[PDB]
Amino acid sequence: GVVAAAEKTKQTKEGVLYVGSKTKEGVVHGVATVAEKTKEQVTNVGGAVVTGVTAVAQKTVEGAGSIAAATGFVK
Amino acid sequence: GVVAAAEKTKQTKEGVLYVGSKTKEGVVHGVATVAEKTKEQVTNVGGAVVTGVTAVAQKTVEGAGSIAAATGFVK
Amino acid sequence: GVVAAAEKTKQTKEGVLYVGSKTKEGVVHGVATVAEKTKEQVTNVGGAVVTGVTAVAQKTVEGAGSIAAATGFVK
Amino acid sequence: GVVAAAEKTKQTKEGVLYVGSKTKEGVVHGVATVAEKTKEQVTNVGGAVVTGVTAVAQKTVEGAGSIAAATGFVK
Amino acid sequence: GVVAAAEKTKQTKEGVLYVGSKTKEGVVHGVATVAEKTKEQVTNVGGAVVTGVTAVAQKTVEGAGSIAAATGFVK
Amino acid sequence: GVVAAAEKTKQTKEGVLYVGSKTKEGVVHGVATVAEKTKEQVTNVGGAVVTGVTAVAQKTVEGAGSIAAATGFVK
Amino acid sequence: GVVAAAEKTKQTKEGVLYVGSKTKEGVVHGVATVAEKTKEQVTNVGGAVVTGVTAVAQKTVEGAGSIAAATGFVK
Amino acid sequence: GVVAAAEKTKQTKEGVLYVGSKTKEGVVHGVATVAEKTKEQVTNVGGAVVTGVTAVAQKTVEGAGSIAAATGFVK
Amino acid sequence: GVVAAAEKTKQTKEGVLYVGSKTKEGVVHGVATVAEKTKEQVTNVGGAVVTGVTAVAQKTVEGAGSIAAATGFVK
Amino acid sequence: GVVAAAEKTKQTKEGVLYVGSKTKEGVVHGVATVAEKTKEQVTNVGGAVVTGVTAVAQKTVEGAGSIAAATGFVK
């Protein structure tokens, strides 16, 4: 029973963004899952993932955001 | 029973962002899961992940945000 | 029963951000889970993770934010 | 019964941030979980994690924020 | 019964931040959990974790913030 | 018989130099002799060697300059 | 017979130099001789070696300059 | 017979120098001789070696300058 | 027969120098001879070696300067 | 026969120097000879060695300067 329910019932500068970036070398890998000689691996990533030399996450969840995750195994 | 419920019922400068970044070398890896010769690994990541040389997370959860996570196994 | 419920019922400079960053070398790894020759590993990360040479987390949870996590195993 | 409930029912400079950072070398690792030859490891991280050479966490939880975590195993 | 409930029912310079940082070398590790040859480890981290060469945590919990954590095992 | 003989017998702006250089990154190696797994190497450098991002060699040999070089081997 | 003989027999702006340099990063190695796993190496450097981000060699040899060099081996 | 003989027999702005240097980072190695696992190395450096981010060599040899060098071996 | 003979027989602004240097970080190594696991190394350095972030060598050899060098071995 | 003979027989601004240096960090090593696990090393340095963040060598050899060097071994 992995249920994620989100409801949004709705009846000057807002959220204005300025970014200036100057990079010479950049290595960004984000979400990564590496397995070497591994017998068993389970990985789950949910939600907002902002990454990089200049990472800005503004006003990410204004309304309703549900992240339900059942990660794992059964023997 | 992994349930995540979010409800948002709704009946000058706000949230204004300024970022200036100057980088020469940058290595950003974000969310990573590395397993080497590992027999068993379970990993869960939920929510907002902001990463990098200049990471800014402004006004992340304005409304309703639910992160329900059942991470693990059963033998 | 891993339940996360968030409800937000709603009937000059606010939240204004200024960031200036200057970096020469930067290594940012964020959320990481490393296992080497490990027989068993369970890892859970939830919520807001802001990381990096200049990490700013402003006004993260304005409304309702629920993080419910049941991490572990059963034998 | 790992329940996290958050409710927010709502019927000059506020929250204004200024950051100036100057770094030459920076190594930031954030949330990390390392296991080497480990037979069993369970790790849980919840909430807001702000990290880095210049880490600022302003007005993190304005409303309702619940972090419920049941971390561990059963034999 | 690990329950965390937070309720916020609501019917000049406030919260204004200024940070100036100048670093040459910086190593920040944040939340870390290291296990080497360990048979059993359980770790839980909850709440707000601000770390780094210049760490500022201003007005962290304005409203309601609940951190309920049951960490441990049963044999 | 490696003989170098130089004789100088002597019985408004002259030689005036102006240099303005502006560099951001510069790698200058000059005279270099690299041998890797080499069984035999003979190297000779003679005279004036001017090198670099802004290299100026003005009025190098006003008088007598002799460079005699016998480079090599005998088996 | 490696003989170097120099004789100088002697019976408004002259030689005036102006240098303005502005560098951010500079790596200068000059005269270098590198041998790795090398069985035999012979290196000779003679004369004037001017090197670097802003290298100026003005009026180097006004009089008599002799560079005699016998570089090498005999088996 | 490695003989170096120099004789100087002698019976407004002259040689005036102006240098202005501004560097942030500088690595200067000059005359270097590196041997790694090398069985045999012979190196000779003679004369004037001017090196660095701002290297100026003005009026180096006004009179008599002799550099005689016999570099090498015999088996 | 390694003979170096120098004879000087002698019967407005001259040689005036101005240097202005501004450095933040500087690594200068000058004359260096490094041997690692090397069985045999012979190194000779003679003359004038000027090195560094701002290296100026003005009017180095006004009179007689002899550099005689016999570098090497015999088996 | 390593003979160095120097003879000087002698029967407005001259040689005036101005240096202004401003350094934050400086590592100067000058003349160095490093041997690691080396079976045999012979090193000779002769003459004038000027080194450092601001190195100035003005009017080095006005008269007679002889540098005779026989560097090496015999088996």
Coordinates of N, CA, C and O in Angstrom, one line a residue, chain J:
Chain J
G1 N 93.3 19.1 -12.5 CA 93.7 20.5 -12.7 C 92.5 21.4 -12.8 O 92.2 21.9 -13.9
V2 N 91.8 21.6 -11.7 CA 90.6 22.5 -11.7 C 91.1 23.8 -11.1 O 91.1 24.0 -9.9
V3 N 91.5 24.7 -12.0 CA 92.0 26.0 -11.6 C 91.1 27.1 -12.0 O 90.6 27.2 -13.2
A4 N 90.8 28.0 -11.1 CA 90.0 29.2 -11.3 C 90.7 30.4 -10.9 O 91.0 30.6 -9.7
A5 N 91.2 31.2 -11.9 CA 92.0 32.4 -11.6 C 91.2 33.7 -12.0 O 90.6 33.8 -13.1
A6 N 91.1 34.6 -11.1 CA 90.4 35.9 -11.3 C 91.4 37.0 -10.9 O 91.9 37.1 -9.8
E7 N 91.6 38.0 -11.8 CA 92.4 39.1 -11.6 C 91.7 40.4 -12.0 O 91.1 40.5 -13.1
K8 N 91.7 41.4 -11.1 CA 91.2 42.7 -11.5 C 92.2 43.8 -11.1 O 92.4 44.0 -9.9
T9 N 92.8 44.4 -12.1 CA 93.9 45.3 -11.8 C 93.4 46.7 -12.4 O 93.3 46.9 -13.6
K10 N 93.1 47.6 -11.4 CA 92.6 48.9 -11.8 C 93.6 50.0 -11.4 O 94.1 50.0 -10.3
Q11 N 93.8 50.9 -12.3 CA 94.7 52.0 -12.0 C 93.8 53.3 -11.8 O 94.2 54.4 -12.3
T12 N 74.5 62.1 -10.5 CA 74.5 60.8 -11.2 C 74.3 59.7 -10.3 O 74.8 59.6 -9.1
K13 N 73.6 58.6 -10.7 CA 73.3 57.4 -10.0 C 73.8 56.2 -10.7 O 73.5 55.9 -11.8
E14 N 74.8 55.5 -10.0 CA 75.3 54.3 -10.6 C 75.0 53.2 -9.6 O 75.2 53.2 -8.4
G15 N 74.4 52.1 -10.2 CA 74.0 50.9 -9.4 C 73.1 51.2 -8.3 O 73.3 50.7 -7.2
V16 N 72.0 52.0 -8.5 CA 71.0 52.3 -7.5 C 69.8 51.4 -7.7 O 69.3 51.3 -8.9
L17 N 69.3 50.8 -6.6 CA 68.3 49.8 -6.7 C 67.1 50.2 -5.9 O 67.3 50.7 -4.7
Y18 N 65.9 49.9 -6.4 CA 64.6 50.1 -5.6 C 63.8 48.9 -5.8 O 63.5 48.5 -6.9
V19 N 63.4 48.3 -4.7 CA 62.5 47.1 -4.7 C 61.4 47.3 -3.7 O 61.7 47.6 -2.5
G20 N 60.2 47.1 -4.2 CA 59.0 47.0 -3.3 C 58.2 45.8 -3.5 O 57.7 45.5 -4.5
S21 N 58.2 44.9 -2.4 CA 57.5 43.6 -2.5 C 56.4 43.5 -1.5 O 56.6 43.9 -0.4
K22 N 55.3 42.9 -1.9 CA 54.2 42.6 -1.1 C 53.7 41.2 -1.4 O 53.1 41.0 -2.4
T23 N 53.9 40.3 -0.4 CA 53.5 38.9 -0.6 C 52.6 38.5 0.6 O 52.8 39.0 1.7
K24 N 51.7 37.6 0.3 CA 50.8 37.0 1.4 C 51.4 35.7 1.8 O 51.6 35.4 3.0
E25 N 51.6 34.8 0.9 CA 52.2 33.5 1.2 C 53.4 33.2 0.2 O 53.3 33.5 -1.0
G26 N 54.5 32.8 0.8 CA 55.7 32.5 0.0 C 56.5 31.3 0.5 O 56.9 31.2 1.6
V27 N 56.8 30.4 -0.5 CA 57.6 29.2 -0.2 C 58.8 29.2 -1.1 O 58.6 29.1 -2.4
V28 N 60.0 29.4 -0.6 CA 61.2 29.5 -1.4 C 62.1 28.5 -0.9 O 62.4 28.3 0.3
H29 N 62.7 27.7 -1.9 CA 63.5 26.5 -1.5 C 65.0 26.7 -1.9 O 65.8 25.9 -1.5
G30 N 65.3 27.7 -2.8 CA 66.7 28.0 -3.1 C 67.4 26.8 -3.8 O 66.8 26.1 -4.6
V31 N 68.6 26.6 -3.4 CA 69.4 25.4 -3.9 C 69.0 24.2 -3.1 O 69.2 24.2 -1.9
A32 N 68.5 23.2 -3.8 CA 68.1 21.9 -3.1 C 68.6 20.7 -3.9 O 68.6 20.8 -5.1
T33 N 68.9 19.7 -3.1 CA 69.4 18.4 -3.7 C 68.7 17.3 -2.9 O 69.1 17.1 -1.8
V34 N 67.7 16.6 -3.5 CA 67.0 15.6 -2.8 C 67.3 14.3 -3.5 O 67.2 14.1 -4.7
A35 N 67.6 13.3 -2.6 CA 67.9 11.9 -3.1 C 67.0 11.0 -2.2 O 67.1 11.0 -1.0
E36 N 66.3 10.1 -2.9 CA 65.4 9.1 -2.2 C 65.7 7.8 -2.8 O 65.5 7.6 -4.0
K37 N 66.2 6.9 -2.0 CA 66.6 5.5 -2.4 C 67.6 5.5 -3.5 O 67.8 4.5 -4.2
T38 N 68.3 6.6 -3.7 CA 69.3 6.8 -4.7 C 70.6 6.1 -4.3 O 71.1 6.3 -3.2
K39 N 71.2 5.4 -5.2 CA 72.5 4.7 -4.9 C 73.7 5.6 -5.0 O 74.7 5.5 -4.3
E40 N 73.6 6.6 -5.9 CA 74.8 7.5 -6.2 C 74.2 8.8 -6.7 O 73.4 8.8 -7.7
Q41 N 74.7 9.9 -6.1 CA 74.3 11.2 -6.6 C 75.5 12.2 -6.3 O 76.1 12.2 -5.2
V42 N 75.9 13.0 -7.4 CA 76.9 14.0 -7.2 C 76.3 15.3 -7.8 O 75.8 15.3 -8.9
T43 N 76.3 16.3 -7.0 CA 75.8 17.6 -7.4 C 76.7 18.7 -7.0 O 77.3 18.7 -5.9
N44 N 76.9 19.7 -7.9 CA 77.7 20.9 -7.7 C 77.0 22.1 -8.2 O 76.4 22.1 -9.2
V45 N 77.0 23.1 -7.3 CA 76.4 24.4 -7.7 C 77.4 25.5 -7.4 O 78.0 25.6 -6.3
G46 N 77.7 26.3 -8.4 CA 78.6 27.4 -8.3 C 78.1 28.7 -8.9 O 77.3 28.7 -9.8
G47 N 78.6 29.8 -8.4 CA 78.2 31.1 -8.9 C 77.3 31.8 -8.0 O 77.3 31.7 -6.8
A48 N 76.4 32.6 -8.6 CA 75.4 33.4 -7.9 C 74.1 32.9 -8.1 O 73.6 32.7 -9.3
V49 N 73.4 32.5 -7.0 CA 72.0 32.0 -7.1 C 71.1 32.9 -6.3 O 71.1 33.0 -5.1
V50 N 70.3 33.7 -7.1 CA 69.3 34.6 -6.5 C 67.9 34.0 -6.7 O 67.5 33.8 -7.9
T51 N 67.2 33.8 -5.7 CA 65.9 33.1 -5.8 C 64.9 33.6 -4.7 O 65.4 34.1 -3.6
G52 N 63.6 33.6 -5.0 CA 62.6 34.1 -4.1 C 61.5 34.8 -4.8 O 61.7 35.1 -6.0
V53 N 60.5 35.2 -4.1 CA 59.3 35.7 -4.7 C 59.6 37.0 -5.5 O 59.1 37.2 -6.6
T54 N 60.5 37.8 -5.0 CA 61.1 39.0 -5.7 C 62.6 38.9 -5.7 O 63.2 39.3 -4.7
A55 N 63.1 38.3 -6.7 CA 64.6 38.1 -6.9 C 65.1 39.1 -7.8 O 64.7 39.2 -9.0
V56 N 66.1 39.9 -7.4 CA 66.8 40.9 -8.2 C 68.3 40.7 -8.1 O 68.8 40.7 -7.0
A57 N 69.0 40.5 -9.2 CA 70.4 40.3 -9.3 C 71.0 41.4 -10.2 O 71.0 41.3 -11.4
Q58 N 71.5 42.5 -9.6 CA 71.9 43.7 -10.3 C 73.4 43.8 -10.2 O 74.0 43.7 -9.1
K59 N 74.1 44.0 -11.4 CA 75.5 44.2 -11.5 C 76.3 43.1 -10.8 O 77.2 43.4 -9.9
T60 N 76.0 41.9 -11.1 CA 76.5 40.7 -10.3 C 78.0 40.6 -10.4 O 78.6 40.5 -9.3
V61 N 78.6 40.6 -11.6 CA 80.0 40.4 -11.7 C 80.5 41.7 -12.4 O 80.6 41.8 -13.6
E62 N 80.9 42.7 -11.6 CA 81.6 43.9 -12.1 C 83.0 43.6 -12.5 O 83.4 44.1 -13.6
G63 N 83.8 42.8 -11.7 CA 85.2 42.6 -12.1 C 85.4 41.2 -12.7 O 84.7 40.9 -13.7
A64 N 86.3 40.5 -12.2 CA 86.7 39.2 -12.7 C 86.0 38.1 -11.8 O 86.3 38.0 -10.6
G65 N 85.3 37.2 -12.4 CA 84.7 36.1 -11.7 C 84.9 34.8 -12.5 O 84.4 34.6 -13.6
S66 N 85.6 33.8 -11.8 CA 85.8 32.5 -12.5 C 85.2 31.4 -11.7 O 85.3 31.4 -10.5
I67 N 84.5 30.5 -12.4 CA 83.8 29.4 -11.8 C 84.3 28.2 -12.5 O 83.7 27.9 -13.6
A68 N 85.2 27.4 -12.0 CA 85.7 26.2 -12.6 C 85.2 25.0 -11.7 O 85.4 25.0 -10.5
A69 N 84.6 24.1 -12.4 CA 84.0 23.0 -11.7 C 84.2 21.7 -12.5 O 83.8 21.6 -13.6
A70 N 84.8 20.7 -11.8 CA 84.9 19.3 -12.4 C 84.0 18.4 -11.6 O 84.4 18.0 -10.5
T71 N 82.8 18.1 -12.1 CA 81.8 17.4 -11.3 C 81.7 16.0 -12.0 O 81.5 15.9 -13.2
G72 N 81.9 15.0 -11.2 CA 81.7 13.6 -11.7 C 82.7 12.7 -10.9 O 83.4 13.1 -10.1
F73 N 82.6 11.4 -11.3 CA 83.3 10.4 -10.6 C 84.1 9.6 -11.6 O 84.0 9.8 -12.8
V74 N 84.9 8.6 -11.1 CA 85.7 7.7 -11.9 C 85.6 6.3 -11.3 O 85.9 6.2 -10.1
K75 N 85.3 5.3 -12.1 CA 85.5 3.9 -11.7 C 86.6 3.2 -12.5 O 87.5 2.8 -12.0

